[PDB]
């Protein structure tokens, strides 16, 4: 239970990538050698890496993210699969904390 005192002046703020106005996001897969829109019902954590995250917005064009990991969780005490995109420096500023990759949750 120890803390370190830090003095910091923002001469150079953190220069990282972020998605500022992301709207609903799709999801795709290579389940049957063809790219199909698996919009929901990720019943089992599909262990290969044949999924990509095609986020969509309204203030600028869509962005495509190959997935990193699929993990079951309970965002609201529900069967929810946690999925994360991969990029060199992409971060998500949610709830006053910094996440090293973009993440969203499938409720259904």
């Amino acid at each position: 239970d120890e803390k370190k005192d830090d003095i910091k002046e923002e001469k150079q703020v953190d220069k990282k990538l972020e998605l500022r106005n992301i709207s609903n996001v799709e999801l795709y897969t290579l389940e049957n050698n063809k790219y199909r829109h698996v919009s929901s019902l990720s019943s089992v954590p599909t262990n290969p890496e044949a999924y990509f995250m095609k986020v969509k917005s309204e203030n600028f064009k869509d962005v495509m993210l190959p997935v990193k990991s699929i993990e079951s969780a309970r965002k609201d005490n529900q069967d929810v699969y946690k999925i994360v995109g991969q990029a060199n420096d992409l971060i998500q500023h949610e709830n006053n904390i910094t996440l090293e990759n973009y993440t969203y949750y499938l409720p259904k």
Binding site: E10, V13, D14, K15, K16, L17, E18, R20, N21, I22, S23, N24, V25, Y28, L30, K34, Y35, S40, E49, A50, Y51, F52, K54, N59, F60, K61, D62, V63, M64, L65, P66, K75, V80, G85, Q86, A87, N88, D89, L90, I91, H93, E94, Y104, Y105, L106, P107, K108
Partner: protein
């Protein structure tokens, strides 16, 4: 009703930041189009760095990047060369240009600095190579005939009805000849690809273009 998105992930707020200024709200909104793909801290810092004298205060729309009035689009093919000019089409239907230099790009995003007002411009592309996709699908696009049967099937046309009512055959041959550059620019300007190691997204783009080659 929605399903766990567009509300918790919306997070477009520019108010109540560390150095947020209510007066410079529209300044931040204008500078957003100049510097996409960056954190809110950087964007508010640069908005605070905006001089009050310059015309960035008025409403701004999407900028474009011309090189001596050539209006380049393929950033990856021209990031090394200087895109000297950068038009700023404001919502007031007024056009301004600015001197631009290339300096200190990331591995993904390219940074351009404006000498006069010490601001930064970035384009809407991650400098991702489309060489793999274009080489995969080139020779497939090259084997399409304007008067063939597949092209007729793509249209809602019968075999009897002629194609002479379109007047596009010579331009069809022209676009067959120069499909390389046009396809590269389209792939650069359609969406954003952040892939680094795998090829699943590139293969998805290849499948999408291959499925509708004649329509394209």
């Amino acid at each position: 009703i929605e399903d766990f998105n567009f509300s918790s992930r919306y997070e477009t707020d520019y108010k109540n930041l560390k150095d947020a200024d209510v007066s410079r709200l529209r300044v931040y909104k204008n500078i957003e189009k100049l510097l996409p793909f960056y954190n809110r801290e950087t964007i508010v810092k640069y908005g605070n760095l905006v001089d009050a004298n310059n015309t960035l205060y008025t409403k701004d729309l999407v900028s474009v990047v011309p090189m001596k009035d050539k209006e380049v689009i393929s950033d990856i093919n021209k990031n090394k060369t200087s895109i000297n000019k950068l038009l700023l089409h404001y919502s007031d239907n007024t056009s301004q240009t600015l001197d631009i230099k290339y300096l200190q790009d990331f591995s993904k995003v390219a940074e351009y600095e404006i000498a006069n007002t010490k601001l930064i411009y970035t384009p809407n592309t991650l400098l991702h190579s489309y060489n793999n996709i274009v080489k995969a699908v080139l020779n497939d696009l090259k084997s399409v005939q304007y008067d063939s049967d597949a092209v007729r099937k793509v249209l809602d046309i019968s075999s009897n009805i002629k194609l002479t009512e379109l007047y596009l055959d010579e331009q069809f041959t022209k676009t067959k000849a120069n499909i390389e550059d046009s396809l590269s620019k389209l792939l650069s300007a359609d969406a954003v690809i952040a892939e680094n190691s795998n090829s699943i997204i590139d293969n998805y783009v290849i499948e999408k273009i291959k499925n509708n080659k004649e329509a394209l």
